[PDB]
């Protein structure tokens, strides 16, 4: 029964003040308080703050100066604002239960990234192999945003794939595909990869060619 | 500025006994916590106050608090049971809680696997840009922890470099490298490599324009 959940915004501005309501139900904040944690992609977790039963709050030392914690006992709803945003801001967000000194039940996540990039189209490259089966590669290049589709002669192409994690720096993102094929096949017969960023309207064709 | 220290890693075969180890200054004083972590999910309270147990929890997790060493035990570890660890604690100094550095506790259920190394070089159609993008792709190693370094000409090379996170493909782990830099400063180097280290062994990839 007792649950709570994370509602906000997963894209912001290294300007805009982050606002996030985390829900209770089950319980009731009136005897209960709410503390929130954060976590950089591949990092620890950290404590951010806490809202108590009693309405008395704390906040953590290198978080302070810029952050705010309040509710609305009466919708069971607990609010958190970070106001001067920048990139490592960017984090999955927890609100969880305070239970004397533990924290007995959690919220499912909310992931926000703080980014200043606009939506941009990728370019694709093509990778063959510089001089008893080949690989070839599609590299998708400086896209924002998550995600990107990457197929291989439309489907046709389902053994053999490999899709790689998109990477980021200076704003833009990067990832990469590739597949073996029989080394008979390439290059008597075409191979062709289909990337697609639903974000930008972008449908690219990339055919793979010996140089 | 209270902090406590975990071993970042812990491999075990399955059917073994994992410790994990939460330090601090008096650490036997105040209470300790651990939570369980799987990937993109939130923590899991699996013990508090020292050595105890939340209902539906495991009875295979038991943990301890003496000295100024905390210990999260797994004794038959099970594949279920790999994922990040968190010990915790509060501190009265200032009023704040703190989480320890983390233990990924990697539960090892099959043969250490080599990985395939391709190491692409940079596309034409890129080149007219006046960049250069290489790309060093990574292929079925297990268990998922790499390291990866570039060097040019005998130099290691650190800078425009960025590496995806492992990532598990079918039965075995896979993850890309990148060396990102002008068109010409690819064209002036006479070979590049990228090392990518996995258990006690490297493999090695060259790319000499």
């Known amino acids: 029964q007792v649950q709570l959940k994370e509602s906000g915004p997963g894209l912001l501005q290294p300007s805009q003040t982050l606002s996030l309501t985390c829900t209770v139900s089950?319980?009731?904040?009136?005897?209960?308080?709410v503390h929130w944690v954060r976590q950089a992609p591949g990092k620890g977790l950290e404590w951010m703050g806490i809202?108590?039963?009693?309405?008395?709050?704390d906040y953590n030392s290198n978080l302070k100066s810029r952050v705010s914690i309040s509710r609305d006992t009466s919708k069971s709803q607990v609010f958190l604002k970070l106001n001067s945003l920048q990139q490592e801001d960017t984090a999955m967000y927890f609100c969880?239960?305070?239970?004397?000194?533990?924290?007995?039940?959690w919220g499912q996540g909310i992931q926000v990234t703080v980014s200043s990039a606009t939506t941009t189209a990728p370019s694709v490259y093509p990778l063959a192999p510089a001089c008893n089966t080949v690989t070839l590669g599609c590299l998708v290049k400086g896209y924002f945003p998550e995600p990107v589709t990457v197929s291989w002669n439309s489907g046709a192409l389902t053994s053999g794939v490999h899709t790689f994690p998109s990477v980021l720096h200076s704003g833009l993102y990067s990832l990469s595909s590739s597949v073996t094929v029989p080394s008979s096949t390439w290059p008597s017969q075409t191979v062709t990869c289909n990337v697609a960023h639903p974000a930008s309207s972008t449908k690219v064709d990339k055919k793979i060619v010996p140089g | 500025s209270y902090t406590l220290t975990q071993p970042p890693l812990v491999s075990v075969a399955l059917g073994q006994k994992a410790t994990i180890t939460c330090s601090g200054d008096?650490?036997?004083?105040?209470?300790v916590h651990w939570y369980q972590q799987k990937a993109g999910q939130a923590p899991v309270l699996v013990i508090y106050?020292?050595?105890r147990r939340p209902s539906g929890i495991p009875d295979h997790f038991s943990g301890s608090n003496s000295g100024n060493m905390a210990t999260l035990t797994i004794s038959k570890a099970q594949a279920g049971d790999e994922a990040d660890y968190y010990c915790?604690?509060?501190?009265?100094?200032?009023?704040?809680?703190?989480f320890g550095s983390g233990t990924k506790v990697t539960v090892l259920g099959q043969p250490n696997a080599a990985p395939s190394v391709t190491l692409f070089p940079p596309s034409s159609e890129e080149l007219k840009t006046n960049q250069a993008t290489l790309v060093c792709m990574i292929n079925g190693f297990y268990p998922a922890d790499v390291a990866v370094t570039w060097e040019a000409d005998g130099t290691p090379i650190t800078q425009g470099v960025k590496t995806t996170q492992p990532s598990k493909s079918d039965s075995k782990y896979m993850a890309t490298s990148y060396l990102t830099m002008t068109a010409d400063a690819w064209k002036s180097r006479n070979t590049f490599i990228c090392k990518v280290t996995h258990g006690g062994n490297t493999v090695e990839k060259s790319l000499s324009p």
């Open positions: 969880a239960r305070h239970f004397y000194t533990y924290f007995d039940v």
């Open positions: 089950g319980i009731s904040l009136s005897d209960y308080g």
């Open positions: 809202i108590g039963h009693a309405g008395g709050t």
């Open positions: 008096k650490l036997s004083d105040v209470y």
């Open positions: 106050e020292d050595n």
């Open positions: 915790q604690s509060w501190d009265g100094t200032n009023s704040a809680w703190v």
